[PDB]
């Protein structure tokens, strides 16, 4: 049923766009964290969570690429 396959192709591509969408929305608030105060604990805590949102931004980029393959590959079958 190529009328259901290609449907699942496009429906799942609009879910990956909507996912890419939230991914770049959360970029700035998860990676531009200023320290709450001017001590060493406040600095450490903000440096990690920004290192973490940065590392998340690559991991998600690499994940989406492989989602892009499955939507292509699923789509190819016809």
């Amino acid at each position: 049923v190529p009328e259901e396959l290609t449907a699942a192709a496009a429906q799942l591509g609009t879910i990956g766009a909507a996912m890419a969408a939230q991914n770049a929305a959360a970029a700035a608030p998860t990676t531009a964290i200023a320290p709450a105060a001017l001590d060493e604990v406040s600095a450490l805590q903000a440096a990690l969570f920004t290192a973490y949102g940065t590392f998340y931004q690559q991991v998600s980029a690499e994940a989406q690429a492989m989602h892009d393959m499955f939507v292509n590959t699923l789509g190819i079958s016809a």
Partner: protein
């Protein structure tokens, strides 16, 4: 260094300045906004591979497609938990700051005590005031112990809030 080795004038100057909880809760809400949208993206994969298998779009080999999708469906459910975790840990982080600000002696309350010490010394010509001079000194040491105990307790909780699940790309099953 050591926070307890620092006088109250420093631990509270450095705490009563800065950005507040604001940046951290914005981090939090963001992490929850992704935890939410990882899972809705997982719940609809779980809907298409689960109708693919059930209806059997490509016979005995419908499997092959479920297979293909698995490494990225796995990453979805695993990372959603990761993001919800960072969400609650961004906020745990900030409640740690807000508790340490609450207990840190305000900078003006410290210097007020210091100026009273200077005032009682200038007028202690007959030494009649010395017990207040040394009562003013004890109260300072109390502020010194309160600021230290606030910073040490802040450090402690920021460790428990600094704990994040390792993130990784998807790899083949």
């Amino acid at each position: 260094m050591d926070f307890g080795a620092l006088p109250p004038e420093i631990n509270s100057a450095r705490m009563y300045a800065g950005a507040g909880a604001g940046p951290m809760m914005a981090a939090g809400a963001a992490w929850n906004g992704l935890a939410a949208e990882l899972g809705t993206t997982a719940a609809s994969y779980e809907s298409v591979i689960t109708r693919l298998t059930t209806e059997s779009w490509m016979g005995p080999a419908s499997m092959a497609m479920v297979a293909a999708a698995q490494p990225y469906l796995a990453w979805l459910t695993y990372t959603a938990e990761a993001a919800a975790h960072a969400g609650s840990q961004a906020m745990a982080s900030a409640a740690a700051y807000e508790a340490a600000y609450a207990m840190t002696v305000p900078p003006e309350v410290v210097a007020a005590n210091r100026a009273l010490l200077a005032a009682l010394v200038a007028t202690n010509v007959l030494g009649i005031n010395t017990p207040a001079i040394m009562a003013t000194e004890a109260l300072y040491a109390e502020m010194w112990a309160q600021d230290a105990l606030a910073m040490y307790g802040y450090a402690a909780a920021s460790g428990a809030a600094g704990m994040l699940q390792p993130l990784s790309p998807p790899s083949q099953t």
